[PDB]
Every structure is written in structure tokens, then in C-alpha cells.
Design a protein around this ligand. Sequence first.
Ligand SMILES: *[C@@H]1O[C@H](CO)[C@@H](O[C@@H]2O[C@H](CO)[C@@H](O)[C@H](O)[C@H]2NC(C)=O)[C@H](O)[C@H]1NC(C)=O
Ligand SMILES: *[C@@H]1O[C@H](CO)[C@@H](O[C@@H]2O[C@H](CO)[C@@H](O)[C@H](O)[C@H]2NC(C)=O)[C@H](O)[C@H]1NC(C)=O
Ligand SMILES: *[C@@H]1O[C@H](CO)[C@@H](O[C@@H]2O[C@H](CO)[C@@H](O)[C@H](O)[C@H]2NC(C)=O)[C@H](O)[C@H]1NC(C)=O
Lengths: 23, 72, 49
Amino acid sequence: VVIGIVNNTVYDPLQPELDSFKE
Amino acid sequence: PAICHDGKAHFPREGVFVSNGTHWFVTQRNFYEPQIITTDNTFVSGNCDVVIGIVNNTVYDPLQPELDSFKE
Amino acid sequence: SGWTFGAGPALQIPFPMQMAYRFNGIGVTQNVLYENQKLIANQFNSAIG
Ligand SMILES: *[C@@H]1O[C@H](CO)[C@@H](O[C@@H]2O[C@H](CO)[C@@H](O)[C@H](O)[C@H]2NC(C)=O)[C@H](O)[C@H]1NC(C)=O
Ligand SMILES: *[C@@H]1O[C@H](CO)[C@@H](O[C@@H]2O[C@H](CO)[C@@H](O)[C@H](O)[C@H]2NC(C)=O)[C@H](O)[C@H]1NC(C)=O
Ligand SMILES: *[C@@H]1O[C@H](CO)[C@@H](O[C@@H]2O[C@H](CO)[C@@H](O)[C@H](O)[C@H]2NC(C)=O)[C@H](O)[C@H]1NC(C)=O
């Protein structure tokens, strides 16, 4: 619905930090 | 005016609490856009027995289910 | 109705919430009035007297 949107990814600070430690 | 979940009062960061009859949401003042009452758009201060007109409800937590399901 | 009756149709609202908004306007958070409501009301009444 938003006219002119683009494509990109957004970094999440929590995900790698709590995925590396959980292993 | 406030919501008390764990014996602690929760106040909106910017907006007003509104109940449609069954649930409770937080909305902006000049337009109707309800949202789930998480712990990110509210702040905690004081006990549960200092304010007047408080109600009883639970506040959603986004990290707890995500990290309890994964930590298993 | 607070200030909402100047722009468009009036919108009812409880008074303590209106005072909370007016403290929030000048940079004082809402967690002050909801505690000091009794003292604030007493001071207001004394001044208006
Ligand atoms: C941004 O990425 C999405 C995919 O996540 C694109 O959506 C699909 O794009 C493909 C082409 O790569 C099309 O064949 C599909 O029909 C698209 N599906 C939908 C539901 O739109 C999207 O096109 C990308 N953005 C742009 C501007 O191309
Ligand atoms: C008040 O809002 C709540 C939002 O959760 C409504 O509850 C949902 O209503 C839809 C409509 O049938 C159901 O499909 C959902 O399953 C309901 N949610 C839950 C958790 O049960 C509620 O109906 C609204 N009240 C009124 C009077 O409209
Ligand atoms: C909100 O929940 C709390 C409990 O977390 C209620 O506090 C107790 O409620 C029971 C029954 O409602 C009373 O018998 C106790 O005396 C209450 N204890 C305290 C310390 O308040 C509280 O009453 C609930 N609020 C409402 C409006 O029902």
C-alpha cells in the first residue's frame, strides 16, 4: 500500500548475540 | 489512567489507554490506531496502590516467549 | 472537553487526564500528577479562594 517503498534488510542487534551464546 | 500487572503501575509513553469492551489497547490521541499493550510503549513507576482509578490487566512481553521457546 | 472544542466538535475527557496532558506539555511526565493529585487540588482551591 505504500507508494515508493524499496527492498532492503534491517539488522537486529539481539538475534546474533542470543544465537551465538545459545549454542 | 494506568494498568497494574505485576503489582506495578504502567503508564503510556505517548498515548491513551482504550478498551473496546473486552481487551485493552494503547492509541494515539488524534486518531484511532489500537495496538497490543507491550512493554516497549509503556514505562513503570511506583507501586499499585498510589494512583486513583487503576485497573487490572496483563502486559504482553515479546522477548519471553521467543527466548523460552528457543532456549529449550 | 479540554482544548478540542476549538478545532472541531467537542470531545469529552476526564479532567485528571486533561491535567496530566497539560503537565506533559511542559516537560513533566504523567507520573507526577497521579500521585500528587490531592495536594494539587488543595493548592488550586486555596489560590482560587
Ligand atoms: C522486493 O522483494 C519481494 C520478495 O520478497 C518482491 O516480491 C516479489 O518479487 C518477484 C520478483 O523477484 C515477483 O515475481 C513477485 O510477483 C513479487 N511478489 C509480490 C507479492 O510482490 C518485490 O517485487 C521486491 N521489490 C521490488 C520493487 O521488486
Ligand atoms: C474488542 O477487540 C478484541 C480484540 O482482541 C476482539 O476480540 C477478537 O474479536 C474477533 C472478532 O470475531 C475474533 O475473531 C477474535 O478471536 C477475538 N480475539 C480473541 C483473543 O478472542 C473483540 O471482539 C472486540 N470487541 C468488540 C465488542 O468488538
Ligand atoms: C487486581 O489483582 C490483585 C491481585 O494481583 C487484587 O488484589 C487482591 O484482590 C483480592 C480479590 O480481588 C483481595 O481479596 C485482596 O485483598 C487483594 N490484595 C491486595 C493487596 O490488593 C486486586 O483486588 C485486583 N483489583 C481489582 C479491581 O479486582
